Enzyme design. Structure first.
Site, mmCIF file in Angstrom:
data_model
loop_
_atom_site.group_PDB
_atom_site.id
_atom_site.type_symbol
_atom_site.label_atom_id
_atom_site.label_comp_id
_atom_site.label_asym_id
_atom_site.label_seq_id
_atom_site.Cartn_x
_atom_site.Cartn_y
_atom_site.Cartn_z
ATOM 1 N N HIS A 108 0.845 -1.204 0.000
ATOM 2 C CA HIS A 108 0.000 0.000 0.000
ATOM 3 C C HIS A 108 0.879 1.252 0.000
ATOM 4 O O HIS A 108 1.774 1.323 0.853
ATOM 5 C CB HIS A 108 -0.926 0.009 1.237
ATOM 6 N N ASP A 142 -10.974 -5.752 6.928
ATOM 7 C CA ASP A 142 -11.056 -4.303 6.864
ATOM 8 C C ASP A 142 -9.932 -3.829 5.944
ATOM 9 O O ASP A 142 -8.777 -4.218 6.092
ATOM 10 C CB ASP A 142 -10.946 -3.676 8.250
HETATM 11 N N1 LIG Z 1 -11.019 -7.408 2.162
HETATM 12 C C1 LIG Z 1 -9.900 -6.884 1.643
HETATM 13 N N2 LIG Z 1 -9.028 -6.196 2.417
HETATM 14 C C2 LIG Z 1 -7.726 -5.618 1.662
HETATM 15 O O1 LIG Z 1 -7.068 -4.986 2.728
HETATM 16 C C3 LIG Z 1 -7.448 -5.761 0.358
HETATM 17 C C4 LIG Z 1 -6.148 -5.068 0.089
HETATM 18 C C5 LIG Z 1 -6.708 -3.691 -0.424
HETATM 19 C C6 LIG Z 1 -5.780 -2.886 -1.601
HETATM 20 C C7 LIG Z 1 -6.113 -1.420 -1.271
HETATM 21 C C8 LIG Z 1 -7.523 -0.997 -1.961
HETATM 22 C C9 LIG Z 1 -8.521 0.020 -1.374
HETATM 23 C C10 LIG Z 1 -9.758 0.225 -2.082
HETATM 24 C C11 LIG Z 1 -10.039 -0.548 -3.330
HETATM 25 C C12 LIG Z 1 -11.331 -0.324 -3.929
HETATM 26 O O2 LIG Z 1 -12.093 0.486 -3.450
HETATM 27 N N3 LIG Z 1 -11.676 -1.088 -5.032
HETATM 28 C C13 LIG Z 1 -13.036 -0.971 -5.679
HETATM 29 C C14 LIG Z 1 -12.712 -0.610 -7.087
HETATM 30 C C15 LIG Z 1 -11.948 0.705 -7.220
HETATM 31 C C16 LIG Z 1 -11.628 1.062 -8.615
HETATM 32 O O3 LIG Z 1 -11.939 0.363 -9.583
HETATM 33 O O4 LIG Z 1 -10.987 2.213 -8.653
HETATM 34 C C17 LIG Z 1 -13.886 -2.301 -5.462
HETATM 35 O O5 LIG Z 1 -15.099 -2.240 -5.581
HETATM 36 O O6 LIG Z 1 -13.272 -3.495 -5.150
HETATM 37 C C18 LIG Z 1 -9.054 -1.515 -3.894
HETATM 38 C C19 LIG Z 1 -7.830 -1.713 -3.211
HETATM 39 C C20 LIG Z 1 -4.787 -0.583 -1.432
HETATM 40 O O7 LIG Z 1 -5.405 0.855 -1.107
HETATM 41 O O8 LIG Z 1 -3.993 -0.661 -0.584
HETATM 42 C C21 LIG Z 1 -4.315 -0.231 -2.861
HETATM 43 F F1 LIG Z 1 -3.189 0.499 -2.793
HETATM 44 F F2 LIG Z 1 -4.110 -1.452 -3.343
HETATM 45 F F3 LIG Z 1 -5.195 0.350 -3.763
HETATM 46 C C22 LIG Z 1 -8.490 -6.541 -0.331
HETATM 47 N N4 LIG Z 1 -8.397 -6.818 -1.675
HETATM 48 N N5 LIG Z 1 -9.649 -7.063 0.421
#
Ligand SMILES: NC1NC(=O)C(CCC[C@H](c2ccc(C(=O)N[C@@H](CCC(=O)O)C(=O)O)cc2)C(O)(O)C(F)(F)F)C(N)N1
Length: 200
Positions: A108, A142
């Site tokens: 991240h 989360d």
């Molecule tokens: N439950 C769960 N918990 C996690 O901690 C994961 C790791 C998250 C990666 C982070 C992240 C934060 C928010 C999103 C998100 O809102 N995705 C949306 C689609 C957004 C889009 O198409 O722009 C959607 O609808 O999925 C996507 C990635 C990140 O902010 O760190 C970064 F940098 F990767 F972007 C994961 N995949 N699942």
């Protein structure tokens, strides 16, 4: 350890992981690369490294559980031990995350807990920090809130754009993400039963 990398884009993080897992004494090998999006450069990078790829289009699934199950099917097909999220942009469902608990890592581009979410650089610039950085963490339900493995601070320069700040932070990401992968793949760093990170 057998490693899958999930991507959604350019794959610069993927590239650094490929390179490090092929250095001598590596405890990890990248066996599969999965993208939720077709025609992204990270797929070319994987193929150029002789690593199989799949495209699993998230838009073709009714819900996240079914999409995640399709991912999980492939991870099983490849006998995968550890999953790295490297610019992967889909939030994963509870049951997937629970299954992969202690075995799935994410990179991240901020010093968590600041600037959670996919636009961390835009947040850092609005907020006016002079120091930001990047974080490798175990993936928890989360978003951007799982247990922290490594972090590295990166200066913000006066006059930075999202592009220039992003590039400087990527350089640090390419250092800590392979290092964290090696730590977890060697069993040096584990997620403990008490939910806290454990260094053996
Ligand atoms: N439950 C769960 N918990 C996690 O901690 C994961 C790791 C998250 C990666 C982070 C992240 C934060 C928010 C999103 C998100 O809102 N995705 C949306 C689609 C957004 C889009 O198409 O722009 C959607 O609808 O999925 C996507 C990635 C990140 O902010 O760190 C970064 F940098 F990767 F972007 C994961 N995949 N699942």
């Amino acid at each position: 350890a057998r490693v899958a990398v999930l991507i959604s884009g350019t794959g610069s993080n993927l590239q650094a992981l490929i390179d490090s897992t092929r250095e001598p004494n590596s405890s990890a090998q990248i066996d599969i690369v999965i993208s939720n999006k077709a025609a992204v450069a990270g797929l070319d990078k994987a193929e150029r490294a002789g690593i199989p790829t799949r495209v699993i289009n998230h838009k073709l699934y009714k819900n996240r559980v079914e999409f995640d199950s399709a991912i999980d099917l492939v991870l099983e097909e490849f006998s995968i031990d550890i999953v790295c999220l490297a610019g992967f942009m889909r939030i994963l469902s509870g049951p997937f995350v629970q299954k992969w608990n202690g075995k799935m890592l994410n990179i991240h581009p901020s010093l968590l807990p600041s600037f959670k979410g996919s636009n961390a650089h835009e947040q850092a610039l609005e907020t006016g920090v002079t120091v930001t950085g990047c974080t490798v963490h175990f993936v928890a339900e989360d978003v951007d809130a799982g247990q922290i493995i490594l972090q590295e601070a990166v200066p913000v320069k006066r006059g930075d754009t999202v592009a220039t700040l992003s590039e400087r932070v990527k350089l640090a990401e390419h250092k800590i993400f392979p290092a964290a992968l090696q730590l977890v793949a060697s069993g040096t760093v584990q997620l403990g039963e008490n939910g806290k990170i454990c260094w053996v």
